[PDB]
Subunit: 388 residues, 4 copies
């Protein structure tokens, strides 16, 4: 009934506990489960749900052949109950397209989907399940957005978009929406040199987004947004604990205002929680491919170019495939602090497992604990040979 305001700080993060897991590939071996990728999680005031980009076919369906493809007319943003798999019969379509974001402002949910050919893409902004505003491509090269949830404050929901080359200078914009309408947009400023797929969270200080430099960087760009003034700045995570993938080995001095070099023209969506001594970074374990996942406690990672881990937790073993990761929080939970959460996309199939002709994923998700909890590891769990 009222817009949510970001009035709390992050809860102290001493470990991570299991929040959700859908086992979608395991179940989809023998159930009508939609092929997906680019999943995330987002909360309403009364419910938290899984989100992803469907490929408009089930995994066992013959149309799963070719689903490594990123952008087709058969994709849509869908949502479904927490820890259920995305099935044909329980998935709610939020909008049509092949790149998305979504968030609830306390009153209603805004969802954004982009569709179109590479040179003529357009975003449609939905609010309370109705289309409200539209944004045409500005650089005519795959207009695209976060692939995880946005964050709102007093009705204002900033969203990061990029249009242009994925392997060079591009045109990144921050849009400020309210009830789906465009209040304002800004071109990217600050020292981040390339921006993709921002993972955002909000707290009393403002909104923090950790992104993917797909051009020259293996450190992650950060965009900090003031949703009241509707302004932002950008830089990189200063820490030498590098968190993109693929990536070089960790040095002892990171880079605050420029890409850390070694790997070009690639990356993976990821996230971090940047909160002084309460700072935690997520990354794939492997420096070469999207396998494994760990959280590392790196004090002042955002600002300290010497910072190293003082604690950690394995989420997925290096022997198991991971993928995209991003942040979300239940802004409507009771208590005096916001509990940090994240999900990890567990990609199965192509390109790495090419005995099948499809690409899909399942989801695992965690939230922070003030306890120091024992760790497990959370594989997708499907046997690829069952699909042969």
């Amino acid at each position: 009934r009222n817009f949510n305001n970001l009035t709390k700080g992050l809860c102290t993060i001493n470990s991570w506990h299991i929040y959700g897991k859908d086992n979608a590939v395991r179940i989809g071996e023998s159930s009508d489960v939609l092929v997906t990728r680019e999943p995330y999680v987002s909360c309403d005031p009364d419910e938290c749900r899984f989100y992803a980009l469907s490929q408009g076919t089930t995994i066992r369906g013959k149309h799963s052949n070719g689903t490594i493809h990123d952008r087709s007319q058969y994709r849509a943003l869908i949502s479904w109950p927490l820890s259920s798999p995305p099935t044909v019969y329980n998935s709610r379509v939020e909008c049509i397209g092949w790149s998305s974001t979504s968030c609830h402002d306390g009153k209603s949910r805004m969802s954004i989907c982009i569709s179109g050919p590479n040179n003529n893409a357009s975003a449609v902004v939905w609010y309370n399940r109705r289309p409200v505003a539209e944004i045409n491509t500005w650089a005519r090269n795959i207009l695209r957005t976060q692939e995880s949830e946005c964050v709102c404050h007093n009705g204002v929901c900033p969203v990061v978009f990029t249009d242009g080359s994925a392997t060079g200078p591009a045109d990144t914009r921050i849009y400020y929406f309210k009830e789906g309408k465009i209040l304002k947009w800004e071109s990217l400023t600050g020292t981040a040199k390339h921006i993709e797929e921002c993972s955002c969270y909000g707290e009393r200080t403002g909104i923090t987004c950790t992104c993917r430099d797909n051009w020259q960087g293996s450190n992650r760009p950060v965009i900090q947004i003031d949703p009241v003034a509707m302004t932002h700045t950008s830089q990189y995570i200063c820490s030498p604990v590098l968190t993109d993938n693929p990536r070089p080995n960790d040095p002892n001095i990171g880079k605050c205002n420029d890409p850390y070099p070694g790997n070009n023209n690639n990356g993976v969506k990821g996230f971090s929680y940047l909160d002084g001594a309460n700072t935690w970074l997520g990354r794939t374990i492997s420096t070469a491919s999207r396998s494994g996942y760990e959280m590392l406690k790196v004090p002042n990672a955002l600002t300290d170019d010497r910072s190293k881990p003082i604690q950690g937790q394995t989420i997925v073993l290096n022997a198991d495939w991971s993928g995209y990761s991003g942040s979300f929080m239940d802004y409507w939970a009771e208590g005096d602090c916001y509990r940090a959460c994240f999900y990890v996309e567990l990609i199965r199939g192509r390109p790495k497992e090419d005995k099948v002709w499809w690409t899909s994923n399942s989801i695992v998700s965690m939230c922070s604990s003030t306890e120091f909890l024992g760790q497990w590891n959370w594989p997708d769990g499907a046997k690829i040979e069952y699909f042969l």
Copy 2:
């Protein structure tokens, strides 16, 4: 809680954006998706849904054999969540029959289904999910109706029916319903010479229906209805931009008060938005068969027999199958204008793809934008060979 009144004009239409798409044939290759045809879209005050005539079998089911047939005892009007496919487990049956219309009046939804043999058909009018009134055939020859949504004003919901020959003079009536009860009916008046499958929308000026002349015309008949006086007139779209299918090539002078000749005893359900300089017409790209779909901006198409396009947008490539098309709007959306919307039925199977024994469809739907958005094309997307 109150009846909706048509108090707004159309939003300015500068392009079209994707609204919904269910990918039903793709998904139905390996899911329990009902065989359908004659789909449409209609909104409640709190939700918009897909509608269609089920054939009472799934596509993979052996009973899909023979579903080219138009009128069986196994058909029903079903509705299901926007952009989901019509599955056995998520489809709500509105009423039983093989021709239908449906609309919400602001308080409750009226649904009409016609069933029966060709010489003894009858309509049942449902209101708030209960049968309220019934109408017996008057010409004993396939009593039939719109196959898209009706429109209401202050509780009054006009509906166009036809009974009689589909290839000659027939008996068309306009009925005026309120809470499912018959207030009044009228025989067709005006210059339209044959009427089928009217696609309607409402705005402050009244209700506008674009129909199908299945007898001698390839221009589309139009019926204009005053839901307050409960009266109507009819003519044809004057424009030489002809919009039926099949159809002759576009001349330079159209016909306002008589069928444009060249093609007899056939047609396709279609629609238009007739709003002065803000006028847009939909049509198949092919003049020979139901393939492709485009929208054309044709100023004053209704009244100007010389009018030509000044802008357009491709919806479906000519290389891809289309089918029926019709209008709907979310009359309960916020703002100062009604946003024009439409759907296109994408028919797959027989008669054109006869290596399968079934006929079904999927749906694509668009709404207008005040932006000038880039265009894509929206194929059904199923590979027919997967069903062999």
Copy 3:
């Protein structure tokens, strides 16, 4: 919020219109549809639903083998949305057992299921989805009940039970429930000599039940119940238009107070609407087996032993299988009269179609019209050979 009172008379019945049809066997050929039998329909104040006794297996499931059996531990009363099929995923279990009745009193629904071996069966009475009262067998021989909906007045819902031989004298009781609790029960009185499977409806005059004499009669016993005094009487339909199955040919004088002879130890559940000149009887067309179905207007059938039809309507052709039939009405519909409704069970499989090893059914349902509507015929529609 208040108990419903029976304050209206029946609407004038001039013909019948299609109300619902689920096509369950057609769809179940390739969908997870539960095997059922003994279906019915019953309304809540906000919704009308299909009901039936599941067999605890789908039709395609290997456990469908043997489902001709009447009483197993795997049966349950289920309900599901009007005109949907009874699927594993959309069916709500009301209670466990192999004989049932159910009705809404205006505030909440009472459901009764009987389970047990032949000599030790017991009824459990559920109210507002909780078990409230239980009734043990009194004759130790298949305690059993209506297999269609009961009817309530000011909270009082009478139900007819039988315990004892199905082919001789048995012990029939009328129970009077309120909020699931037993107010009173009575032994059968009047001239009906054997009672099974009563089909009931209520109006201002009281509650009328048409039953099945499975012993010596081919005319139908009738029980008339005053839900205020909680008393009843019984007789037979006097009309020589005989309505059981199997049955002798129609004579010219029927029997008011004794079974009409010719066929012993068999019958079928059926119904009638007994309302003076507005009287309609349902029956199978065949006198030999459960095939075909027709409604006949037989003025004063209840009291006139000479009464013959003056109008009729075919529901199912004799060439198509029928089965059980029963009455229900939407007591919560608006207007000044109760609209008579009925369903027909369309049995497929064993014993008549024994190339399959299962027995199931679909449902067709009609309601009365004050119009004189054209008639169609409504087959189950499944091709049995598809299941081989």
Copy 4:
């Protein structure tokens, strides 16, 4: 809106009536039914539901191979509508883990799931569908809990946990939760020597839990909890009617304060209702394996070491497989007493039926009657050979 208080005594138990049964294995032979084990039942103020630990695969799915395993990353506590089977499309995930409990306090539901490796397991406590508190392992040996519902009084919901050896002395704790937060915990006191899988119910006197001694006992330990003082005591059921499995034959003197010897390092979850002369015990019929199930009326079983049965009821024949059993009640039912209920897990597959590679179950559930009802028997009902 208010916390439930335990203000009533147990209803007099004179027999048991069928409450629910899902036939999950029968249906899962040809439907997307999840593999489960460790099921239970629990009520909300407006609904009662089935619960179980999913294995993250369907029965027909190839991933059902190996589901005898107790603790994997693919398990989750799910709930689903009463007497429906646990399907992919109707099951709601409550939390992730391989051991669980859940209960409603009158306002909202608390659910607890434990996950992790054997030496590093942790419990997450959810309240109103959000994670609220976490508890780390204290003995580093399979932290584990009830596998049936907990019970609340004025917001306080006690839960019994065990950590440590399953075949020797272990560390059992009673936790006291309110709105998911830990008010207090206590180490086990009293004469019970080993505690597993407590089955609890509440009434005005307090909360009673019947557990499983997996070490040296074949009599069942009992924990009695005062949810106001938040204190407890423990002992064994004194009766010589022994109720664990496997177990020795019944002696004539039981043991109140020590394990009854004969069988070591095994057991089965079970329950009892301990209420003076109104006392009923459940047990498997076989003393050797988990087959059959019966209820026995054993007056003062808790305190009388000579007590023997004076009445009984067979639930499952010895010829049929049973498994875990536990207590629940609808604390929100109307009336002056709490109606005792229980469920029995009917395990199918491995280890006893090893021609299949999976292990799953279905559920049967009963509630008490004040009538003396006839008894039936309730097998799972699936034919194992259909799965070959």
